[PDB]
Amino acid sequence: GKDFRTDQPQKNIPFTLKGCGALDWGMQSRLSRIFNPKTGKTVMLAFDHGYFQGPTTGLERIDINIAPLFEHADVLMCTRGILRSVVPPATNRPVVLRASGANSILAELSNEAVALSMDDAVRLNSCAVAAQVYIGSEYEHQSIKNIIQLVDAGMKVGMPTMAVTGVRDQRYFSLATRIAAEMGAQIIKTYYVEKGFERIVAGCPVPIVIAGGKKLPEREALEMCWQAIDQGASGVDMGRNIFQSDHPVAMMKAVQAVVHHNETADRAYELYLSEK
Amino acid sequence: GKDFRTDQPQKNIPFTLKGCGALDWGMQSRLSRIFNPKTGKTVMLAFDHGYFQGPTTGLERIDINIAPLFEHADVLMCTRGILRSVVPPATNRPVVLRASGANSILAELSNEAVALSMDDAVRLNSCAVAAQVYIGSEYEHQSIKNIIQLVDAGMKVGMPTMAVTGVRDQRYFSLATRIAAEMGAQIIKTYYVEKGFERIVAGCPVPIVIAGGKKLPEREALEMCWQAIDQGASGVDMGRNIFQSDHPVAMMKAVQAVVHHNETADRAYELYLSEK
Amino acid sequence: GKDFRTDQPQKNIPFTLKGCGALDWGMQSRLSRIFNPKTGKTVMLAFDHGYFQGPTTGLERIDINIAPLFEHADVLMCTRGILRSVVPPATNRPVVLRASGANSILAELSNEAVALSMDDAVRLNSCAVAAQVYIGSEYEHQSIKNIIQLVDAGMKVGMPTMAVTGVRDQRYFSLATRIAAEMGAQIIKTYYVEKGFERIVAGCPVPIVIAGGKKLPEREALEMCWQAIDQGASGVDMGRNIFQSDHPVAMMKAVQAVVHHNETADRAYELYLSEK
Amino acid sequence: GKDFRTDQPQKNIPFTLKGCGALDWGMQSRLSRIFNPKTGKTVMLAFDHGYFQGPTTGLERIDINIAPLFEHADVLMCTRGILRSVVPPATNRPVVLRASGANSILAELSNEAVALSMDDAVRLNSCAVAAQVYIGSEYEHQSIKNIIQLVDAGMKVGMPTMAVTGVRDQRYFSLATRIAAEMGAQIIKTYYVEKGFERIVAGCPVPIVIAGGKKLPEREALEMCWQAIDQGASGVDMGRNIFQSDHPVAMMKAVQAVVHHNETADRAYELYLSEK
Amino acid sequence: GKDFRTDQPQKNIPFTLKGCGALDWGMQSRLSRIFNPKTGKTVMLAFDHGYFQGPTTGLERIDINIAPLFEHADVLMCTRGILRSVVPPATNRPVVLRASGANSILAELSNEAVALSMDDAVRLNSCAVAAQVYIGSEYEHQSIKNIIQLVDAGMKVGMPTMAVTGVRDQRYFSLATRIAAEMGAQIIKTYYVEKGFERIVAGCPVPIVIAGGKKLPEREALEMCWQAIDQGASGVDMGRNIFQSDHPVAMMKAVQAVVHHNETADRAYELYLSEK
Amino acid sequence: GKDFRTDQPQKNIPFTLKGCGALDWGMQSRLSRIFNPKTGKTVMLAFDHGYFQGPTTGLERIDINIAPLFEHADVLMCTRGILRSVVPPATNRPVVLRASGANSILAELSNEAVALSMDDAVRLNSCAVAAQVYIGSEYEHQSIKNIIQLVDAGMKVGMPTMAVTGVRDQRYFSLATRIAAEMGAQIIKTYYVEKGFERIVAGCPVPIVIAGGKKLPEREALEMCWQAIDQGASGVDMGRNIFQSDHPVAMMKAVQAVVHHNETADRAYELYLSEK
Amino acid sequence: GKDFRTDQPQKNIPFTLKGCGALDWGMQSRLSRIFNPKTGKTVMLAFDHGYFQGPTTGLERIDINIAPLFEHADVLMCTRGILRSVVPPATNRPVVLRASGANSILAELSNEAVALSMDDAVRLNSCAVAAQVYIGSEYEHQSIKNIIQLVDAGMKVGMPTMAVTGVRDQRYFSLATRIAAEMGAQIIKTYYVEKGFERIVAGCPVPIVIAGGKKLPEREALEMCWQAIDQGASGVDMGRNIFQSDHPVAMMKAVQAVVHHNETADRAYELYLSEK
């Protein structure tokens, strides 16, 4: 009375996430937490700037200002320090730990070191670890070494590594993104570019996520989102453009719309206003 | 132009999951994946029986039969072998890896050993590892040693351990659950008991999940669920009672209702029929 | 304008705790948490019996029954499982982790293995780790090996080891306590003996703590306490005799008095009744 | 005849210490040794200055001058060298080991390295390890790296890390404290600021303890204490302001009062005089 | 009824690959994948330039441009990043992983560090790992240290190391190739030289492979190939000269012919045109 | 004005201790602590019997009975437990730690395991570690494995191993001593034999020390000592025959005389009486 | 003025030793010490029997009896105990360390365990390590495991492993030798067989050395040697047949002759008598 369904042969489900087709199950799993499998994209709420900047504006009180924001994000990005202290475990959202540091705004910006062991990143159940790479800066060599070291460790343990390009035109980000990706980073985070972003994406063999940069009027930020996605980015991280907006949650739903659901910039903006 | 909100002092968000208030962030995180923070409960779809049983009925083809079932479960439980081969990473559901094995239905049932390294469990992004404890059986000592070893390893790494009690009355399950919990297991999985289940829960300091046992008519299984939850269980795993039902998905929604939403057995059953 | 007080030469303060004069600072420190430096004694509240016994009477609900008891104890003794789940860290009392297990009341009692890694004992900030030795029982060899192994590990890390003698006359406890001590245990926990206890203490080169055994009427337990201390024991652990008493806290103050303050059994009992 | 109290369901005791709600039992335990659970605060007697300063005034003879002081402190802070040699283990007080060093007052102050292994810290039963971070100084990068490394090690083992900010206004200590905390330090030690201290506390997600700085007249030091506490500090360390006072013990009870008991500066001072 | 063929004595098959006669079986095996045992030569398709160059011309899209090229190569050479993301495992071709990096075209070229652990190289089933040595450049010391370290690791594990000489006459390449070989590299990759290439090969005790350098008209590249082989090279890597040619596949068959089959430059070229 | 004394060539001082001529400096040093370089012999005061025997007669109180005895011994032999608790470090005598145990007089005698890690032996500054071998007993295999393991460890670290033969004629001790020595033990401890002791010594390639065995009248013990030495033993250990004598110190001087100074039994005995 | 001899191409010298053509340089080097490269054979003087036998006849005093014998042997075989104590390092002969033991002639012969770490073998500069395999005996499983373990370790380090077959006809030694070889042993040592030895050799893919067995009259031992060599053995070990002969040295020259130089048995014997 057992059925092996011999007439129907087992078939492998493809993993479509860009450039992550050859990864072990655990690694693909972590990535799948970050990038929605249906849409292949992610909305990331990153608040890690304290790491070299101290209490930046809008990050003065993560526990109050940002805590309400978590639910509307696909993935969180912060330091391990902040995570343990003021991010509730029950927040139940995937995190990308920031794992570079040891610079200040008072000194050379590119002077970064690995800021936590994979050991602890694994201890914290991270979906990925992130570090900054600084092509063209004084400590560009150490920066890449940082990525390298994170990838060596991540590979033993199934932890993806995200390389963030710290700094301004396409040719440049192409170099920076590509080198990072090539070194082994599974996720690249970078900036949007008004001319030639497509080349950047096309040249990168792994998913790209874009950082928001300085605060803009929402309408403009959304347009940037819309453009980035339209041009093949896999996620957007609006930092300042979110936690700094007077209507954060509204903004996020805007961003969710552009990213996952395809809304056009205008509609997006409108529900932006809708949700105030 | 910065606001530290000095008038409002940072306050710690309590972690209410039973007996899990003193765990590092990562461990609390993994547990939060398993047990819903809002309701403090879980619906678990366990298909690990192949481990000593081979192609048991209804588990003949996980890839076909059970694959459709994943989305309606809070947490999956299977072997690492099965997980890699036929569970799609994109399934994006938390897994509890079954980590004991080396027994057959052809020999002594309690003769189990640890069946994978924490190393690999971590590599596979598990939310927990599970092993069987066999109080009263011939290899009861090894079984506990197994739990012990998994907890020693999990604590290095933030991985919770689930001890499952393999075997029939309350006093008995009390002993078995309690010893396991006392050894260190963060989650206990065990069987429902018509008389005295409350004592079992009350005496266990950590979350309890119940296994379904042999297939029953749905109405009866739901009643069992309803009872277990009403009596303080933190989740239910209906194995056979689900994958074997002619209308699996419908059953799961039934179970979701009882567990998370509080529906009474009858209503539950009714949407059971509703969903066919 | 600096004073080195050359006329007054630095002198070493002796460490008087019995048999612990040649230990490193950290180990001496942990022992000092357990045994009061002024009186050289400890009142221990041990509730670890669940470890092979399940929900023994009075330990049904540690979180409710025993939780109120902590403050009146010098040192707590429990399993790591119970400690993490239901002992509040803020309890701020030194713990001795029970580190043997894998036996049941359903099987041979002496069949114990080491139940946690020093690694985790250290992670849990223990003052000491404890295991049972079973001279004359079937698994007496393993039991000693367990002590040995715990001492090998504790020495790397500054962790004292407590050997408990599980089982009935003096000559016997002498053999057992002495072997344990000799193997390397810093603390011996054992049973009181109506004839010859003095020889037991005298023959042990390290501190002895006595377990209470089965519940007695308080008057009788106190007398036993009084006798044990009078005869050179360094501490008492009244398990059942405390958590099972109808007036626990009162009992503890009774015990405190006998142990630290020297009250005679009768006075002790009287404030026993006083404190109800 | 057993009572599981089923009518009464086990509930988790919150851990209220600021930013320490997501830590494993052991680490929470160590912290609870330092910061009183009832008041959430600590009085710290730090005499570690020898580390780069040699026999500073008042620290000429720890063994004579400071030894009497121990009992009136919540936590001690010294080097491992001093601890072993002249702090009696029986002192029975929690210690925070100073773990940075390799600088002299004869050379660049910020040139510090890690000055002991976590291995030894654990061997010494520390409640935490401390190192200095030097934002703005020449070796600011190494200083952070030192914190990072101590956190990486401490997390393996349950050991909290204290970052002390070495150097003068709020905006500055905000940057320094926040980066350290963000890197992962569980305790921040810093200086009081007459304007804007609240922002410093508000911006730090973990407990802050303030250093006394140069000796002041007691009345003034108390006011500083009072102000620090009133403004949200979790502890105070009056170094010079204590061991250098002509009436040390009296001062401490003054500080105890302000810190734990809430006395107003004036009353505090008065029992200061009272206790001479 | 068994035949041991005693009349015929077992004889050892020689391993003829240059300078690889004293290697363990596994190492010999990996080399045998790379260099054809019959002809003792290899045709290598290297696309690792992204590593310090970003999306160089013709490497813009490995996945599209180069993917078709794989089947006609003996061995592939790329970074671990590119390999995982866009090289299909089923490509079933031996790879030599590029294992140096951390330089940019924006900074000193010779500033390279080891860019992956042997650990991961082994995890990726590599046939060899490669790094650049830079005699005469600013970071020539680190470069050799790099080779050293890879050989140290590769020897533990059976992994050959390729040293590539980055930079122009014979005497020079002799120095560079020889030092690398001498340090321990099993494969040397270097440039062709119009005068004195013979001395270069003759002085190297291990196989040499030549890099193509800047794109040339095919006829000329083939002549270079032909010459290199004729003068004792063991393989050629035409990078640009292949992926940049308008007729890549045709080129490779050209190169295959010269290398393995001995065709003269002219015939080679002709089938070059033939295969368009 | 420097003199290299070229006319006088550096010459190597031989190391004459039997069978120890090919040992590294550290190991030769430790052995030199035990066996006097001038006479090549040792007087050993062993009190380790508590290890399986409990408080044997005369070892009831090491701290009182045996403490006076240390100064008159070349080397001490006890457990690590006893050593830490009641042997003063300032005793300044070399120790041979007893490193086997886990047996009781209540069970099979030969059932021993390694009783402490070389790690701790080294931590205790031992001159050697000792374990028992039991040829012909039930656990003879494990006993030899014990010796093997200690040697494996000791060789990493410069620690000599002493194998004691536990049990009755020459042919027998020859087998036992020789196997142990052959396995790798640097020192053999064994019993004296009235016929054929010479063959035992002659067949052992490394130093032999003899155990006293049951208490005898001093005159007879001395004669045994005298005979053992006369027949080539390298040391004697009179356990019972010393600590049990009514005039211990006198006895030791007797033994010193026979062993190091060559006194004849009678003279020896006489100063025995002399020294009462 | 440099000559690279381009006209003459580097060629690989074959390594002809049987079944050792695919080993790393170091391993081939150690084997080359044992087996003469010219003749591909070895004369081994083995005196390791003390290991389970005690002072066997003729091994009573290695230092005297056997010491003279070393120079006339190609390779020595003894225990590590004996080697350190009584084999002079200056003996300058290759040794094969006996690495199994823990049996006695008083108990089951096949009960052997690994008797030293590869770590020490390497420390002693061994050419190989040897252990016994016991097909058909009670502990045959452990015996093979022993070989396995040694090979695992030896391969890390370049150390060949010799398996000796302990026990009587061809079919039998075929099984035994072949299994050992197959497991991974590089050298097999076994007994000569009057019928079918050829099959044994032919069936073994690696060098075979024969043990002499019980003492025979020289003429007969020589004939055995001659026959073994004639039938394809790669070396002989005459233990007893040498150290027990009245004219040892003469015997060895006899054996040398048969083995390396091809002398016929008779001539061999004659120079046997010649050399007395």
Numbering used by the authors:
A (entry chain Q), B (entry chain N), C (entry chain M), D (entry chain R), E (entry chain P), F (entry chain L), ...: 10 to 176, 182 to 290
From the paper:
The LsrF oligmer has a disk-like structure, with two rings of five monomers stacked on top of each other giving rise to a decamer with D5 symmetry.
In a departure from the typical (αβ)8-barrel fold, the first β-strand of the LsrF barrel does not start until residue 51. Monomers stacked on top of each other have extensive interactions that are significantly enhanced by a ‘swapping’ of N-terminal residues. Consistent with this conclusion, only decamers were observed in gel filtration experiments (data not shown). A single water was built in the binding site of unliganded LsrF; this water is displaced upon ligand binding. Structural alignments of LsrF with a variety of type I aldolases, including FBP aldolase from rabbit and T. tenax, ADH synthase from M. jannaschii, and transaldolase B, DERA, and 2-keto-3-deoxy-6-phosphogluconate (KDPG) from E. coli show structural conservation of the catalytic lysine with LsrF K203. The aspartic acid is then thought to donate the proton back during the reforming of the imine.
